[PDB]
Amino acid sequence: LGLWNRLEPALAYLAPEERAKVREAYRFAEEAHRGQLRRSGEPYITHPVAVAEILAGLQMDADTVAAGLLHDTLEDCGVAPEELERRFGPTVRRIVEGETKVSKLYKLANLEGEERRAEDLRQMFIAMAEDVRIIIVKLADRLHNLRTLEHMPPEKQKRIAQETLEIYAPLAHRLGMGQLKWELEDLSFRYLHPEAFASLSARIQATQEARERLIQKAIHLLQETLARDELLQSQLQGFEVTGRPKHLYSIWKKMEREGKTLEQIYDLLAVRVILDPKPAPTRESQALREKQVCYHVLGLVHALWQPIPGRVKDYIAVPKPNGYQSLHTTVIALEGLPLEVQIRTREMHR
Ligand SMILES: Nc1nc2c(ncn2[C@@H]2O[C@H](COP(=O)(O)OP(=O)(O)O)[C@@H](OP(=O)(O)OP(=O)(O)O)[C@H]2O)c(=O)[nH]1
Ligand SMILES: [Cl-]
Ligand SMILES: [Mg+2]
Numbered sequence: 001l002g003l004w005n006r007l008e009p010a011l012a013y014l015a016p017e018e019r020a021k022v023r024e025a026y027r028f029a030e031e032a033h034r035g036q037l038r039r040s041g042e043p044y045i046t047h048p049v050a051v052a053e054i055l056a057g058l059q060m061d062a063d064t065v066a067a068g069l070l071h072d073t074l075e076d077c078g079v080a081p082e083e084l085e086r087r088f089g090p091t092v093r094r095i096v097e098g099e100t101k102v103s104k105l106y107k108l109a110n111l112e113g114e115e116r117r118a119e120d121l122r123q124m125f126i127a128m129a130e131d132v133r134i135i136i137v138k139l140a141d142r143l144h145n146l147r148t149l150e151h152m153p154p155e156k157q158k159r160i161a162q163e164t165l166e167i168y169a170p171l172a173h174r175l176g177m178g179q180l181k182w183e184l185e186d187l188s189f190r191y192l193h194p195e196a197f198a199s200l201s202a203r204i205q206a207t208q209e210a211r212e213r214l215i216q217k218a219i220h221l222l223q224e225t226l227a228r229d230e231l232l233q234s235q236l237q238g239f240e241v242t243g244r245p246k247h248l249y250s251i252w253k254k255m256e257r258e259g260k261t262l263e264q265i266y267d268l269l270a271v272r273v274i275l276d277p278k279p280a281p282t283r284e285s286q287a288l289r290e291k292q293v294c295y296h297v298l299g300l301v302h303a304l305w306q307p308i309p310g311r312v313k314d315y316i317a318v319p320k321p322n323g324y325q326s327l328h329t330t331v332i333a334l335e336g337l338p339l340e341v342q343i344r345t346r347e348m349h350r
């Protein structure tokens, strides 16, 4: 019964009329999946709710989160695509059919073992899904699927992990969805190489207590500094200051390719600043504000901690090929330690 009351808070960024479509979508799904269960014993509705929840975290188009609740209704529910277009419009229908159709299409596809196999399969999804939202929902689906992979046989656990590492994690990268790309990698690594994962995880959880003690000093300090700045706060609706989680798959990938141990690889401390700009009267007003507020923070970060020369990186002005936007700066803090600071808005956070 906890469902929806869990999701609703995450929908705060949507207009009332949009939230209204998402409640209608949830309720419809709730009905379609009535009596259905997951291989976890939970009612099926928990999965599309979790997928919708992921998309709302990613602050997606209303039609996209509604499609998140409806991405599995076209199978064993007695729902025809005509019903979804009739009730939730052609975009929600397009996306749900798109996400459903591809899963089967990948099952048919024969590139298993052939050199550069993933590349030609990734391009297959790219070439067919002109609306990326189809892919985003498929990623949100595979994410939640991997989160609940303990209720699956070790054959499926290894099959899913490899597929995510070959197909979906690189697709998450192409779309500039790093938060997803990271989670997908670390989760795939868990189930694909358990012995290697459990070894690396326990080696980090040995120094983790002391690391986040240090990281929290930086967080608290940078938080208070921003909150005390009157002019930044006037143009701001809210902000989050958080540590960057260790990319265990990226850590281990390097550790094998260029040799070395976890102790041999340098643990560069990082802190992220997510900024929620206050709603501006125009689309231009909001756009200029989005940049303005980020550079405002860069200044405050240098005023707080001594910047290391040449370590300022502007990806707002010059986005990465996959569209990545953020402001990077390496400073000295915590009594002489290098700390990386990533400044971005909520929109930039992917
Ligand atoms: N991880 C997980 N999966 C569960 C669970 N219960 C049922 N499933 C279903 O398993 C499907 C994924 O792997 P399969 O076991 O091969 O199901 P399938 O034969 O239809 O492909 C998922 O549909 P799907 O959305 O199409 O994912 P996928 O088929 O693209 O992999 C998901 O709905 C569970 O508790 N955990
Ligand atoms: Cl991260
Ligand atoms: Mg999946």
Ligand SMILES: [Mn+2]
Binding pocket: 047, 071, 072, 141
């Ligand atoms: Mn699904």
